Each structure stands twice: as C-alpha cells, then as structure tokens.
Design an enzyme around this catalytic site. Structure first.
Site, PDB file in Angstrom:
ATOM      1  N   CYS B 106       0.923  -1.186  -0.068  1.00  0.00           N
ATOM      2  CA  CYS B 106       0.129   0.018   0.109  1.00  0.00           C
ATOM      3  C   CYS B 106       0.968   1.230   0.176  1.00  0.00           C
ATOM      4  CB  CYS B 106      -0.994   0.117   1.309  1.00  0.00           C
ATOM      5  SG  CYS B 106      -2.389   1.326   1.156  1.00  0.00           S
ATOM      6  N   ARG B 109      -0.362   4.385   2.821  1.00  0.00           N
ATOM      7  CA  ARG B 109      -0.348   4.280   4.277  1.00  0.00           C
ATOM      8  C   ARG B 109       0.242   5.381   5.245  1.00  0.00           C
ATOM      9  NH1 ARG B 109       3.725  -0.737   4.676  1.00  0.00           N
ATOM     10  NH2 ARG B 109       4.385   0.029   2.548  1.00  0.00           N
ATOM     11  N   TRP B 278      -9.584   5.885  -0.915  1.00  0.00           N
ATOM     12  CA  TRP B 278      -9.651   6.353  -1.931  1.00  0.00           C
ATOM     13  C   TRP B 278      -8.567   6.155  -3.073  1.00  0.00           C
ATOM     14  CZ3 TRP B 278      -8.521   9.307   2.669  1.00  0.00           C
ATOM     15  CH2 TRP B 278      -7.143   9.942   2.769  1.00  0.00           C
ATOM     16  N   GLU B 283      -4.972   3.720 -10.835  1.00  0.00           N
ATOM     17  CA  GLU B 283      -5.543   2.411 -10.668  1.00  0.00           C
ATOM     18  C   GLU B 283      -6.692   2.407 -11.906  1.00  0.00           C
ATOM     19  OE1 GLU B 283      -6.029   0.948  -6.548  1.00  0.00           O
ATOM     20  OE2 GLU B 283      -5.781   3.217  -6.049  1.00  0.00           O
TER      21      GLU B 283
HETATM   22  C1  HEM Z   1      -6.517   6.163   1.429  1.00  0.00           C
HETATM   23  C2  HEM Z   1      -6.318   6.074   0.414  1.00  0.00           C
HETATM   24  C3  HEM Z   1      -5.493   4.989  -0.007  1.00  0.00           C
HETATM   25  C4  HEM Z   1      -4.552   5.114  -1.580  1.00  0.00           C
HETATM   26  C5  HEM Z   1      -4.658   6.138  -2.124  1.00  0.00           C
HETATM   27  C6  HEM Z   1      -3.907   3.709  -1.294  1.00  0.00           C
HETATM   28  C7  HEM Z   1      -3.334   3.262  -2.415  1.00  0.00           C
HETATM   29  C8  HEM Z   1      -3.145   1.805  -2.559  1.00  0.00           C
HETATM   30  C9  HEM Z   1      -2.607   1.516  -3.789  1.00  0.00           C
HETATM   31  C10 HEM Z   1      -2.224   2.213  -4.966  1.00  0.00           C
HETATM   32  C11 HEM Z   1      -2.312   0.038  -3.989  1.00  0.00           C
HETATM   33  C12 HEM Z   1      -1.765  -0.907  -5.070  1.00  0.00           C
HETATM   34  C13 HEM Z   1      -3.426  -1.529  -5.524  1.00  0.00           C
HETATM   35  C14 HEM Z   1      -3.393  -2.110  -7.046  1.00  0.00           C
HETATM   36  O1  HEM Z   1      -2.601  -1.817  -7.783  1.00  0.00           O
HETATM   37  O2  HEM Z   1      -4.563  -2.655  -7.111  1.00  0.00           O
HETATM   38  C15 HEM Z   1      -2.992  -0.486  -2.588  1.00  0.00           C
HETATM   39  C16 HEM Z   1      -2.993  -1.760  -2.225  1.00  0.00           C
HETATM   40  C17 HEM Z   1      -3.338  -2.014  -0.931  1.00  0.00           C
HETATM   41  N1  HEM Z   1      -3.769  -1.321   0.001  1.00  0.00           N
HETATM   42 FE1  HEM Z   1      -4.009   0.804  -0.026  1.00  0.00          FE
HETATM   43  N2  HEM Z   1      -4.477   2.885  -0.434  1.00  0.00           N
HETATM   44  C18 HEM Z   1      -5.552   3.550   0.017  1.00  0.00           C
HETATM   45  C19 HEM Z   1      -6.184   2.945   1.328  1.00  0.00           C
HETATM   46  C20 HEM Z   1      -5.857   1.655   1.929  1.00  0.00           C
HETATM   47  C21 HEM Z   1      -6.677   1.333   3.336  1.00  0.00           C
HETATM   48  C22 HEM Z   1      -7.824   2.271   4.245  1.00  0.00           C
HETATM   49  C23 HEM Z   1      -6.296   0.011   3.518  1.00  0.00           C
HETATM   50  C24 HEM Z   1      -6.478  -0.879   4.705  1.00  0.00           C
HETATM   51  C25 HEM Z   1      -7.144  -0.574   5.663  1.00  0.00           C
HETATM   52  C26 HEM Z   1      -5.337  -0.241   2.421  1.00  0.00           C
HETATM   53  C27 HEM Z   1      -4.701  -1.727   2.166  1.00  0.00           C
HETATM   54  C28 HEM Z   1      -4.223  -1.903   1.049  1.00  0.00           C
HETATM   55  C29 HEM Z   1      -3.691  -3.467   0.987  1.00  0.00           C
HETATM   56  C30 HEM Z   1      -3.959  -4.677   1.778  1.00  0.00           C
HETATM   57  C31 HEM Z   1      -3.312  -3.434  -0.406  1.00  0.00           C
HETATM   58  C32 HEM Z   1      -3.027  -4.669  -1.188  1.00  0.00           C
HETATM   59  C33 HEM Z   1      -3.847  -5.565  -1.119  1.00  0.00           C
HETATM   60  C34 HEM Z   1      -3.668  -6.633  -2.268  1.00  0.00           C
HETATM   61  O3  HEM Z   1      -2.606  -7.277  -2.416  1.00  0.00           O
HETATM   62  O4  HEM Z   1      -4.649  -6.320  -3.236  1.00  0.00           O
HETATM   63  N3  HEM Z   1      -5.389   0.735   1.670  1.00  0.00           N
HETATM   64  N4  HEM Z   1      -3.451   0.850  -1.735  1.00  0.00           N
HETATM   65  C1  LIG Z   2      -8.415   0.409  -0.066  1.00  0.00           C
HETATM   66  C2  LIG Z   2      -7.757   0.645  -1.532  1.00  0.00           C
HETATM   67  C3  LIG Z   2      -7.353   2.135  -2.049  1.00  0.00           C
HETATM   68  C4  LIG Z   2      -7.002   2.161  -3.375  1.00  0.00           C
HETATM   69  N1  LIG Z   2      -6.697   3.410  -3.831  1.00  0.00           N
HETATM   70  N2  LIG Z   2      -6.739   0.906  -4.078  1.00  0.00           N
HETATM   71  C5  LIG Z   2      -6.983  -0.298  -3.522  1.00  0.00           C
HETATM   72  C6  LIG Z   2      -6.568  -1.465  -4.390  1.00  0.00           C
HETATM   73  C7  LIG Z   2      -7.704  -2.511  -4.759  1.00  0.00           C
HETATM   74  C8  LIG Z   2      -7.549  -3.419  -5.865  1.00  0.00           C
HETATM   75  C9  LIG Z   2      -8.266  -3.233  -7.097  1.00  0.00           C
HETATM   76  C10 LIG Z   2      -7.792  -4.149  -8.279  1.00  0.00           C
HETATM   77  C11 LIG Z   2      -7.191  -5.137  -7.859  1.00  0.00           C
HETATM   78  C12 LIG Z   2      -6.971  -6.222  -8.938  1.00  0.00           C
HETATM   79  C13 LIG Z   2      -7.818  -5.714 -10.265  1.00  0.00           C
HETATM   80  C14 LIG Z   2      -7.586  -6.908 -11.237  1.00  0.00           C
HETATM   81  N3  LIG Z   2      -8.680  -7.922 -11.390  1.00  0.00           N
HETATM   82  C15 LIG Z   2      -6.855  -5.340  -6.666  1.00  0.00           C
HETATM   83  C16 LIG Z   2      -5.936  -6.569  -5.954  1.00  0.00           C
HETATM   84  C17 LIG Z   2      -6.134  -7.942  -6.716  1.00  0.00           C
HETATM   85  C18 LIG Z   2      -5.405  -9.081  -6.281  1.00  0.00           C
HETATM   86  C19 LIG Z   2      -5.297 -10.209  -6.669  1.00  0.00           C
HETATM   87  C20 LIG Z   2      -4.471 -11.257  -6.444  1.00  0.00           C
HETATM   88  C21 LIG Z   2      -4.282 -12.671  -7.046  1.00  0.00           C
HETATM   89  C22 LIG Z   2      -3.834 -11.131  -5.162  1.00  0.00           C
HETATM   90  C23 LIG Z   2      -3.752 -10.035  -4.306  1.00  0.00           C
HETATM   91  N4  LIG Z   2      -3.096  -9.926  -3.230  1.00  0.00           N
HETATM   92  N5  LIG Z   2      -4.454  -8.847  -4.800  1.00  0.00           N
HETATM   93  C24 LIG Z   2      -6.788  -4.454  -5.563  1.00  0.00           C
HETATM   94  C25 LIG Z   2      -7.471  -0.429  -2.585  1.00  0.00           C
END
Ligand code: HEM
Ligand SMILES: Cc1cc(N)nc(CCc2ccc(CCCN)c(CCc3cc(C)cc(N)n3)c2)c1
Ligand code: HEM
Ligand SMILES: Cc1cc(N)nc(CCc2ccc(CCCN)c(CCc3cc(C)cc(N)n3)c2)c1
Ligand SMILES: C[C@H](O)[C@H](O)[C@H]1CNc2nc(N)[nH]c(=O)c2N1
Ligand SMILES: C[C@H](O)[C@H](O)[C@H]1CNc2nc(N)[nH]c(=O)c2N1
Ligand SMILES: [Zn+2]
Lengths: 411, 407
Positions: B106, B109, B278, B283
């Site tokens: 993330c 954070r 947000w 993304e």
């Molecule tokens: C507040 C604004 C937020 C921004 C701008 C932000 C930004 C991001 C971005 C750019 C990613 C990579 C996601 C992707 O490529 O699909 C990400 C992944 C992640 N974020 Fe954050 N995030 C935010 C809030 C949060 C919150 C509130 C949580 C947890 C409570 C969080 C937990 C994570 C987790 C666990 C992943 C990776 C999950 C996965 O493996 O898909 N995010 N977030």
């Molecule tokens: C809370 C939050 C805020 C923010 N700005 N962005 C996010 C990420 C959300 C998100 C969006 C899209 C995707 C994938 C789209 C493709 N189907 C994901 C994570 C998908 C994923 C897939 C796999 C196989 C593993 C993993 N850890 N995570 C996670 C979360």
C-alpha cells in the site's frame, strides 16, 4: 522441484526447473526480500569444482558430455590448477562463457540477442596502451556507422588480485560532469566524481555540456592512464522532435553506443575484471533516465515550459506529458540518423518471446522484474504482467567496487 | 541483521531494524527471489495472542504493567477454556490500523492511523451484513470527501461458519461474455457475474452495471443485495481539452473497497473485513481502462487523438495513456470526489517511509507494487530501495469462496 510463473494478462503459466542449477545467493531469505536493493584471490580448492561445473555445461552445450575430449580437458584443467593455481580457457570456452553470462543476466531485457555476440579476446593485452587500442577497435566495430553490433572485449583474468586489468570508466562513452562553485552541475551529474579523477589524472576538461570523457585504463595492477577516444569513432545523435521544432534548440544530443565497462565476467571460477560489453539502446534508457532523472540532465522542467503545460499542479500530469515527447524525440532522432535503437514496447514484447522460448528449450529464464519493466508506461508493456523468478546462474556478470576505492597506487 | 536501504536519487540511507520482528514467510530463499509473484489450534493461538498483546500494551506505554499481565492471563484463560478469544474494542482498533500500517503493497499508508473502524462483530445474518456495508459505503463516500474505513464481521471459529463477502470489491462493474465473441463490461468479473446470474441476479446487460453484493453469514450460502444506487457515487470521465472524450461514455466509481481479504489480529482471523480509502488516479486510468484484460480502451482513444498507430515507436500508446490519466484525475477533481495523483501519492509515501524508519525502525514495502504502473522513474519511490517483509497484524489474500464453499 518445479516452480510456476503466471502471466496475469494472458493466463499463460510456465514451469521453471532451471533454478535448480542455481549456485550463488540472492540477498533474500524466508524472512526478507531484497529484490529492490541495487547491490544486495580464489584458492585451488574452490576453483576446480567451479571449473568442472562450467566444463560439464560447456561440454553438454556442444553434445560431448562424458566424451574423451571432455574428460581430457577436465584432466588438463585439474593439472593446470594444482600446478599454477589457475587455468586458461580455450577460445571456444571463452566465447561460450561470454554468451552465457549475457544470457544469464537477469536484469537485461535485451537477451533475445544473447547468441549474437562478437567476442574479442584481448587476453594477450599487457599494457594500458594495448587496452586502448583494443577498446577503439571494439567501439568502431560495435558502432559500425550506426548499424550497431553487440560485442565484448575480454582482457586478462585476475591472478593474485594485485595485477588486475580494469577500465575505470563505468561505460566506454559518457559525458563529463562538472560541479560548479554555485552548486549547479554542468553536463552529466552521474559522472562528476569520475570527471574529477580524470581532471586530476591530467585531462584538459573542455568544460562543456557534452564532453566525451577520456578512457582511464589500468593494465596488470598498474596505475591507470588516460586516452581520448578518437572523436571520429564516437557516434553521436542530436536530439530533435518530429512536431516540435524548438526541441532542437534545447541543444540535446546523446551517444549511440551503450558500453558497460565496470563489471566482472565470471566464467568457470575465473574472474575477468575488465570486460567491456556493448549492444544498443532502448529508447527509455536515454529519454527517461539519462534526461529526466532528477539527479541527471533533468530537462522535464524546460520541456514542459516550452510545451506550456500546466506546471502549477502535478495532477495536470505535466511531467508525464513532457516525458513521453522527450522519448518520442529520442526514438525519432536515432531512427532518422539510422542509429540502431529499440522502443520499450518492442523490446519488452521480444523479451517475453525470448523468455517463453527459454522456458521450453532451457527450463527457465532468470529475470529481475524490478529492472526488466521499463521506467515509463510500465503496465502497457507485456513484462509488467509477467511473474518472474530471479536467481543467479554462472557464467555471470557481477558488480565490482569502483577501482579508485581499492587501487593501491604505485606512484 | 541490521539492514540499510538507499535512495539512489537522494543518497539518503535508512537503517531497517523492524524486520527483525518479521513473523511470517516471504516466498523467497537464498536461491530464488519471488519478489514479483502475485501469490507466493490452542497451542498455535496463545503465542500469537501474546505477541499481539505484547505489542498492544507496548504501543500504549504500559508494557509489563499489571493491566498488561492481567489481560495476558485473561486471554490465556479464555483460550484454554473456549479455544478462541475476543478482542477488546481498543485491541480491534489497534489491530485493524496496524494491518494497514503493515501492508507492504500500500502506497497510501501515510494515512494508516486515520482509519474508522466499524465493529460489526454482533452481526448474525446476510441482511445484517448488508446493513453494515451500506453504512460503511455511506460513511466512507461522505458526498465525495472520502474517508478511510473498515467494517469487521465476526472472526472465524471452526471455519464451518465463516462470514465472507464474495465480491472482491464492494463496488465493481459486471462482465458478460457476448455471442459476438467479445466481452461486455469489465472482463475481470465475468465469472463473478455468472455466479450472480446463477444465484438469481437480474443483470441489466449494460457496460457499467454495479454488481450486487453477495454476502455469506455464519458459513451459510450467500445472498444477493443491490447497494442503493443512490449510495454508489460515480464519476463520468471527461477530458479538460478533448471534448470527444465524453463520447466513449466512460464512468468510474469513487470508492475503492477491498472486500475479499482476510484480516489477522493476534491469531484471530476476520474473513469478512471490507475496507476502503480513495483512489490513486492510475488504478483507474492505467490499469482499469488500459489493461488488455480489462476495458482496454487505448486503441480507441488513440484513434480519436489521430496519432500514428502504424508503429510502436511513435509512443502512441504512451501518449494516449497520459491523456486517459489526465481525464480521470480531471473528472474526479471536478465532481469534487477525493483522488490522488501518483506523484503526490508516492511523494507522500516517501515522507511516510522516513517517519516509519525514524519512529519504528522501518517500513515494509513491496517495490513491485509501490511503484506506479506509469511514469515509474519520475516518481521518487522508483529510486528508493525497499525491504519487503511480513508483520502481523496483516491483511492476507484468501481463496475465492466459490471454490471453498459447500451449499
Ligand atoms: C486512503 C487512500 C488509499 C490509497 C490512495 C491507497 C493506495 C493503494 C494502492 C495504489 C495499492 C496498490 C493496489 C493495486 O495496484 O490494485 C494499494 C494496495 C493495498 N492497500 Fe492501500 N490505499 C489507500 C487505503 C487503504 C486502506 C484504508 C487499507 C486498509 C485498511 C489499504 C490496504 C492495502 C492492501 C492490503 C493492499 C494490497 C491488497 C492486495 O494485495 O490487493 N489501502 N493501496
Ligand atoms: C483500499 C484501496 C484503495 C485504493 N486506492 N486501491 C486499492 C486496491 C484495490 C484493488 C483493485 C484491483 C485489484 C485487481 C484488479 C484486477 N482484477 C486489486 C488486487 C487484486 C489481487 C489479486 C491477487 C491474485 C492477489 C492480491 N493480493 N490482490 C486491488 C485499495
Ligand atoms: C543488444 C541490445 C541491448 C539492449 C536493448 C539491452 C537492454 C538492457 C536494458 C534496458 C538494461 C537495464 C539498463 C538500465 O536501466 O540501466 C540492461 C542491463 C544489463 N544488460 Fe542488456 N541490453 C542489450 C545488450 C546487452 C549485452 C550485449 C550485454 C552483455 C554482453 C548485456 C548485459 C546486461 C547486464 C550485465 C545488465 C545489468 C547491468 C547492471 O546491473 O548494472 N546487455 N540491458
Ligand atoms: C550493453 C548494454 C546495452 C543496453 N541497452 N543497456 C545497457 C545498460 C547500461 C547501463 C548504463 C548506465 C547505468 C547507470 C544508470 C544510468 N542510467 C547502468 C546501471 C549501472 C549500475 C549501477 C549500480 C549502482 C549498480 C548496478 N548493478 N549497476 C547500466 C547495457
Ligand atoms: C506479475 C506482477 O507481479 C504483477 O503484474 C504485479 C506487478 N505490480 C503491481 N503493482 C500494483 N500496484 N498492482 C498490481 O496489480 C501489480 N501487479
Ligand atoms: C531501488 C531500485 O531497485 C532502483 O531504483 C532500480 C529500480 N529499477 C531499475 N531498472 C533499471 N532498468 N535500471 C535501474 O537503474 C533501476 N534502478
Ligand atoms: Zn526476494
């Protein structure tokens, strides 16, 4: 053990068995991944096993494993090590070793080309002057008036580590950098320190924006010596943009020949500390990094200005926009002068094909994703979506500390 | 043991000591780095409980105090007796915020401590879950001035009674295979849309149909609910310069809300814990719009721009990618919906890293995921070495329930 890597764009899953042949370490453990860390005198004892490994590989690649020629060569190397504590590679083994180091270079997107490598054997070189002549022939041959050919020149191996050959330059062609009294830099910031060393060594600095640095060469553990590459041998491309005619007025140019000269070629336990290699540029190497890194020529500002982009908020993505035009410009300029260059889409598409092939024929392709994915437009290139496995195979190209930190000055 | 990380743009070297608390495994060995792979009892529980409670009572300057030891005893008593235990609200809050603090992928954070936690541990049915989720969505959307939140349904017990949200995000567009061979809507949800149809969804067969929630309470078979449309804030995508952009008729939802992950606090497993913040612009604009396996609109946008699509070397994909991303950011800012650009988000995260090194002795960060999917090397995170390791509390991935469930 089998390992699967998946592609998230295409769902193609490949299986790696090659990683089982991996010897060296990664930096990582079960508890830490160091995949984004830039940098994570042998006895007869460690040497022969390494020699054996290599020759067994060599001899498998030519289809003569367990042959009389194989066993004889083993015996020969054995005896040579215990007698002299080292050994000499046949030409054919040197060539194969060099090709394989490239092939094994997990951070190189260009490896579809690994088998086309001109290897120059400079193992008879004894002096800095000799080194300079070998390097000029390499530049000329590699440049080939813009039709660039991959090549590498291999100077003599380390012996006691007191008699090392070394090209002090990190690349054979690079532009000077001059830190100024006001703290601004003229020319390339990456190269300030090396520029100072050269000046210290007696180079008359032109003090321009694009001064090709002199080669600084060490033969046989001796203090190094300065040589100016003949200008006529240095192919350079002025940078202009197809639509923007003011782009030329920025005065930008770059050299055509990417030639790394600070790495260490390890083949069958032997260490080649001077082994300059060259290919051709991927456009982003110049246009993203060399021009648009902040600690480099850093021209994004001036270009955005000239395009009159909205620079008051980063959410205008003015930087992203300037970055693309600069890169269009680099590719346009090189192609226009018929100097070989490859765009980042083409290079990464080729590489995925190379990797697929390598999984079939070889059972793997160690790949460093952090380095293979380009520094712009990452996810619209097919490598972004490709799971990779990074592991180290020999022969290999290794980093080595800059020689001015270690060199023992003769005086 | 002590580990340095260098920024190559600034020469700043930070020292990571926090990884020595690393609990879980990475996927890597000394022989193979798996940095780019997407997915690498009572006895078990007391250490995990103690490790957690130790860090809690340490977080509140009361390590080794009566109150600490008493709680350690109490939980010990409860585990030996009940085979599980229950978090105090305060522990829940601390746990949730730290799962986010410890999420190495993330970039966002810097915000980790401003997390609103909704304790949904008294929920017992899918209708309940649906009520809690609608309230989450509403609170978090906040008329576009979005606020981070998590809603925590009850913990696993015997794994025969898990709560799950089948949706991967709370809000996603449907996907339908067309006899025409091609795909209508978002191709990444095609399977989920068939499960919805299969469980009775009345799909309107449009391109941007907000999918229904599919909620599973108490290990029961999941049920369908349509989030009140009026609660799903959307943004039509226009470009500040190209007037024809409107005519592709693209929209995107304002609320990113990850619903499929598993939250682990002090050994306890919360399988339904949707969370939201947000968006970072890329993304939507780079990944959701331009990926070949997604809405894949690059070709169509570049045509309207009349760029030379004859050769990859004109960088026409790259040109179109930038405008698409300008347009996403522009449309959100105009409709006054929170969004962050990748420059700002990465710049923020570098300031966060420094804080975490200074105040905590490190910050686990996964470079592969932290570096944006466009313009990587002009953002500062590109030059920043990161060390990736696994700390608890954590969000973990978990298998899609259609594979796990029995009806
Ligand atoms: C507040 C604004 C937020 C921004 C701008 C932000 C930004 C991001 C971005 C750019 C990613 C990579 C996601 C992707 O490529 O699909 C990400 C992944 C992640 N974020 Fe954050 N995030 C935010 C809030 C949060 C919150 C509130 C949580 C947890 C409570 C969080 C937990 C994570 C987790 C666990 C992943 C990776 C999950 C996965 O493996 O898909 N995010 N977030
Ligand atoms: C809370 C939050 C805020 C923010 N700005 N962005 C996010 C990420 C959300 C998100 C969006 C899209 C995707 C994938 C789209 C493709 N189907 C994901 C994570 C998908 C994923 C897939 C796999 C196989 C593993 C993993 N850890 N995570 C996670 C979360
Ligand atoms: C033929 C055209 C070539 C192209 C387009 C190519 C492309 C690349 C690119 C883009 C990188 C990453 C560079 C960076 O961003 O700094 C790279 C790294 C590397 N390449 Fe290739 N390459 C080519 C030829 C070769 C040759 C001929 C060799 C060796 C014989 C080679 C060995 C390596 C090594 C060792 C690295 C990593 C260097 C390091 O870690 O500093 N390359 N190459
Ligand atoms: C042979 C060849 C062809 C080609 N297209 N590209 C290359 C890469 C050359 C190269 C040039 C410059 C650099 C320095 C960065 C400036 N862009 C590099 C990376 C050198 C490097 C630096 C550090 C700190 C560590 C390391 N392992 N390697 C590598 C080689
Ligand atoms: C194979 C590779 O790990 C995969 O494409 C990753 C790369 N980096 C990513 N980074 C982010 N932020 N999100 C992602 O989905 C991915 N995908
Ligand atoms: C810290 C991080 O590994 C560093 O910035 C790397 C990232 N990826 C790279 N990729 C290439 N091709 N060249 C580089 O110098 C770097 N630098
Ligand atoms: Zn690793």
């Amino acid at each position: 053990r089998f390992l699967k890597v998946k592609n998230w764009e295409t769902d193609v899953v490949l299986t790696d068995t090659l990683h089982l042949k991996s010897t060296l370490e990664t930096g990582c453990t079960e508890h830490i991944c160091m995949g984004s860390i830039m940098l994570p005198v042998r006895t007869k004892d460690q040497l022969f096993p390494l020699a054996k490994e290599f020759l067994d590989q060599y001899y498998s690649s030519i289809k003569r494993f367990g042959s009389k020629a194989h066993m004889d060569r083993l015996e020969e190397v054995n005896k040579e090590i215990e007698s002299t504590s080292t050994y000499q590679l046949k030409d054919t083994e040197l060539i194969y070793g060099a090709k394989h180091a490239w092939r094994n270079a997990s951070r190189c997107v260009g490896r579809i080309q690994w088998s086309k490598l001109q290897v120059f054997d400079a193992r008879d070189c004894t002096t800095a002057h000799g080194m300079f002549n070998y390097i000029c022939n390499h530049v000329k041959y590699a440049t080939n008036k813009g039709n660039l050919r991959s090549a590498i020149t291999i100077f003599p191996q380390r012996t006691d580590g007191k008699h090392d050959f070394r090209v002090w330059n990190s690349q054979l062609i690079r532009y000077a950098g001059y830190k100024q009294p006001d703290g601004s830099t003229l020319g390339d910031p990456a190269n300030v320190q090396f520029t100072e060393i050269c000046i210290q060594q007696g180079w008359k600095a032109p003090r321009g924006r694009f001064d090709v640095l002199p080669l600084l060469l060490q033969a046989n553990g001796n203090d190094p010596e300065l040589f100016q590459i003949p200008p006529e041998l240095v192919l350079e491309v002025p940078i202009r943009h197809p639509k923007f005619d003011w782009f030329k007025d920025l005065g930008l140019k770059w050299y055509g020949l990417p030639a790394v000269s600070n790495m260490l070629l390890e083949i069958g336990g032997l260490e080649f500390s001077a082994c300059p290699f060259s290919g051709w540029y991927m456009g982003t190497e110049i246009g993203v990094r060399d021009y648009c890194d902040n600690s480099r020529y850093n021209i994004l500002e001036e270009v955005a200005k000239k395009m009159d982009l909205d620079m008051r908020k980063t959410s205008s993505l003015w930087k992203d926009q300037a970055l693309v035009e600069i890169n269009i410009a680099v590719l346009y300029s090189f192609q226009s002068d018929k100097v070989t260059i490859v765009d980042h889409h083409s290079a990464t598409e080729s590489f995925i094909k190379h990797m697929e092939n390598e999984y079939r024929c070889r059972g793997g392709c160690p790949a460093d994703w952090v380095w293979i994915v380009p520094p712009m437009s990452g996810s619209i290139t097919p490598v972004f979506h490709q799971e990779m496995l990074n592991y180290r195979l020999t022969p290999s190209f290794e980093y080595q500390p800059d020689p001015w930190n270690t060199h023992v000055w003769k005086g």
